[PDB]
Amino acid sequence: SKIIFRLLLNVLMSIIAIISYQWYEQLGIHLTVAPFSLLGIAIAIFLGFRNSASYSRFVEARNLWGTVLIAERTLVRQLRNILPAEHDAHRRIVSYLVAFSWSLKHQLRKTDPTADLRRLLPEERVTEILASSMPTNRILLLAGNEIGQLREAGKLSAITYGLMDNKLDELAHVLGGCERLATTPVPFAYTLILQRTVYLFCTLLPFALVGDLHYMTPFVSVFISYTFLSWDSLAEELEDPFGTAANDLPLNAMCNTIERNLLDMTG
Amino acid sequence: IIFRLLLNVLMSIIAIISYQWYEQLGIHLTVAPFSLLGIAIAIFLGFRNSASYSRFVEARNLWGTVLIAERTLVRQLRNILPAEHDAHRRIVSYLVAFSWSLKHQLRKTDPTADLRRLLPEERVTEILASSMPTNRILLLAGNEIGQLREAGKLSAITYGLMDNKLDELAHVLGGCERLATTPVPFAYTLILQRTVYLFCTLLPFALVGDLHYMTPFVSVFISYTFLSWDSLAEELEDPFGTAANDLPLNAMCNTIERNLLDMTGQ
């Protein structure tokens, strides 16, 4: 959908290349294919590496969200297995854990967490969380308070308390990894130039292809332009994995899966 | 894969016998632009198959950890409570339930017969009532270990060491679920398949000038190696499938069960 526009332009520069062609020698222009085949292969190589980097940002982001689900399930498991009777702490903690993940989606989508927070917590908490530098980080400190007082209440050994504390550390690592990938994107520094280069190549290519491909120029030029531009825009979607493009991650579904898992695990 | 090679032999034969008419419109196909495109395709094909490959390997890793963490959890119980064979058999049957249930979840098949062969039916009923049955099998197993802990037969220190093995099985379950629902992005294989198939049909048309009657044998050779490589990526999706090059999840589940049993004198 994004590239259909500029594919048709390339058909036009192709028609312009075909109409302008017989005049090359009157206009003084000689444009052979060998120099463009060298330039095109070097962009291919560079598009290959940039796409590899983008995808691996995607794969990392997906992996970090996988750990929210893994580590919330097993903190709840350890609670049910060591303090089975305290359904009261069960429910408090699960709300923090469910809050943490919706809070994190908003942080990364850069949207308002007030609604989701009120749906799950008391409004005194909702405002303690909204007041923080980082709500997600505030939610974790709160979830740790819940576990801390069970230790001070003697319901946990220092060993079974260390076991659950380690799961909140796993979520701290998820939080940091998501902020690194969010706020430190792939260097934009050249993404502007990284893309300027690929379309400049696609319009000039028919002008250099016609001499060989007299009337087939618009076909082979559009085929070539398709592949180069598809790869470059996938590279740019996948490179903001928390974005809202169609190939980005489905953070809403993932927060829902997370909610259903913990609620099913406590009630 | 074998069908589209023949359409290529046809295209090349069409190109051969329609070659007379090439300058009628001034349509002319050079090899040069097609070798630029064929090289930009080989690169992207190379990178994609890389991701398909890494995805398949991760799934084999995950399943390998099942065997490892289950072997080592049963090892600890045998080494620490060599007397308590009742707990031995209980914990082994949950650990074997987990693999089978994970397999059935990944293949979206019913785990009921397997679960009943291993567990008492009250336990099966608790598991299948869950919207996440394999995750609940872990809660049960964690319970067996915990009452060994609450009955004083394990110290907090080794209880914690066994709980950690359960956390490893939890990472397998998550990673399988994440892989199952997170394919390599479809946009990748969409444009690879559009681009690879178009390029193979057009190719004999551009080879016919250079190779007069030789195009069918060289154009077919070129398209076989691109389609071989492209279809390798498709052999490495669905690692949890049932196909011949999909993982042998059943045989791996039998190995798991075979190990834990010979480990407890059965």
Place this chain on the structure above:
Amino acid sequence: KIIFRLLLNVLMSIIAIISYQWYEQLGIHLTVAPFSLLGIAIAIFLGFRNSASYSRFVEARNLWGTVLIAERTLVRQLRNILPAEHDAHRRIVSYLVAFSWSLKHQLRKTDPTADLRRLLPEERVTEILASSMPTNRILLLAGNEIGQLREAGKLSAITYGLMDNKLDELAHVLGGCERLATTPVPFAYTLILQRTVYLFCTLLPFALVGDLHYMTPFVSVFISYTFLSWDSLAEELEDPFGTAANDLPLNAMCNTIERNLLDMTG
């Protein structure tokens, strides 16, 4: 500074356009086929190199991501288990925060004394800066604070150990950042490939001008822009701790850390 070299190449082309006609008396012939073998090879090497430069920048960010993660969870641990002991909260947070600023000045080679005096008594600042490894001594002192809690019976040996592991993480960060700063990417990779990228871009028109006559500036400028752009991209990524817009925003990261740790302790 890269744009400068573009215009030199435009000149190399117009000189090569006018240098061209006399080529007879010296007998110099330059086809473009050999130059496409060399430009391809350079592009392969430049792509592999940029990959290494990007992976080094990424590891820099991960390192800094870990101080923020490790300092947050150490302070959360303190407030979760000793929520009364705010006299140790303030001392440790001040140590954690000074570790970050000291780490930053260390990587940027600037006087840290302002930040240290702003966060610690002049007794401390005199002591830390007397050491040859100031960031290492801050970790040592932060280790004392937890250790004194360990002897004061306020922490078990277990949770004393758990907080020790967070200082360990910060020890690995200090080491990793030091290792990135002292061990630059093998310089053989930067200027020897900078020279061959440079030589290649100027010598390119003199080999193009045969096939392209007055297009040569237009096409040679395009190619050179491509190579010099990608090569300059690897320039930036590969000194991640530098002071430059594209480089890591260390001052912001340290302010976020300080605001987070204080926000966790009012």
Place this chain on the structure above:
Amino acid sequence: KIIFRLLLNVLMSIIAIISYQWYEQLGIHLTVAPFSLLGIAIAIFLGFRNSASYSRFVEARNLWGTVLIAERTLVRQLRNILPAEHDAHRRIVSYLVAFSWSLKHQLRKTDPTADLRRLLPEERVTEILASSMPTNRILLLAGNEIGQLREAGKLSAITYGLMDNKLDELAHVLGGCERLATTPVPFAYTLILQRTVYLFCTLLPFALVGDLHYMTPFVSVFISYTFLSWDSLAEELEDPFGTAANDLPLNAMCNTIERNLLDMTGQH
């Protein structure tokens, strides 16, 4: 084994010369440009394939490394915690060494009887050999020894846990190696992926004569050597536990760790 295919390349090259005459007698032609597009595609796929093979080799290399690391530090812990318990030192050490040799035999699909019988008493050798997974049973036996030191009260639960971790590392090695052996990720495609390289290297002189009429054999086999080296080297690394020139020296590694452990308990 590959020098045979190189010589067929000089042969094919002589056919190309003495029959090129009659090629256009039919109107059949072979330029270089199509075979240069195809050879570059193959070279790209060879790089990626060799990248995957190599990373299989490095991982098998890291897992064997961990065997030596974990056996050394477990024996170190045993010596440092229980300096007096030499009978226990000796029993565990022979299990550790039995584990390594039995892992080598398991990966190479050879018989471990002689190494087991040199190191352990026959009641345990028949028990180990009876088992479904002998290396796994050796780990279980090593674990019983550490278990009875705990039940006898000679170890804290903590320091008993520090050594039990050492056994878990060896269990991860065992599983990683099992997966790197019976799980070539793709199979009978390497048959395709290398048959492709074989046919390209035979058709190459037919496509080279026109440009370079009798020089083809020297150029045709230079190129063939290049392509077939990279391919066979990929297949060597693909199977790191094999007996090839570029595969793992498991024997040197099993001998190093035996030598380390005897030197570590005062048997050298």
Place this chain on the structure above:
Amino acid sequence: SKIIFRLLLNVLMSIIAIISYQWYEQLGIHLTVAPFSLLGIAIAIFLGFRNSASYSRFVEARNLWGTVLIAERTLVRQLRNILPAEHDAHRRIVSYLVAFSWSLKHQLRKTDPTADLRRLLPEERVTEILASSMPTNRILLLAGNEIGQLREAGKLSAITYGLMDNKLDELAHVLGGCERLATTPVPFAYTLILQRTVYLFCTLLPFALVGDLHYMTPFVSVFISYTFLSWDSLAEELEDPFGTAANDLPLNAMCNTIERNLLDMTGQ
């Protein structure tokens, strides 16, 4: 290096080709550049992949050595933090930790450690350390005897004893990874291929260049051979990161940094 030698011979093959192009028609050799473009690009792809592997193993070697400093630092931190009064064991452990790094240097450089060992430790210990097949291993065992005796004097708990024991496990992983990088290089086929082919390709190339370019052949055939040989010889450096070459890790300075960190941390 030895590279500049090989650049000058390319000036000879070119002038040879310049002055022997005369006889090409008479000798019946035709050498289009096109087939050499296909070989060159192939080799460039393989060289690109290989350099990556070389660079990776170099980066890993620097990483391993970086952990020596981290693990030794924090071990000394834990000792002061946990048993601040025991400056006597502080000094013995640190001399072991210092001997470990110097011995690790000698082991990787394959040089005698006796001098550095004599400088740092009593004579009975130097003899014991030099007897072992792996002195770095024996040094870790000795440092661990120190920690162990502090545990059986009741001066450490089982937990804080564990906290410090982990640091020695870390050091063992360092030893193991370094030993692994030192004994397991990139498979030598990777280079013999890339050494024979890159060299052979670099000299046959002007012979193909002369017909297309006649007297420019030297200038351009040299540019190409510099690019390939730079990239390939640089790979060879990065593959022996523990080598005594100029571009290899500066192991002596890292052992000096390590010795000075550890002395600064302990009063001196």
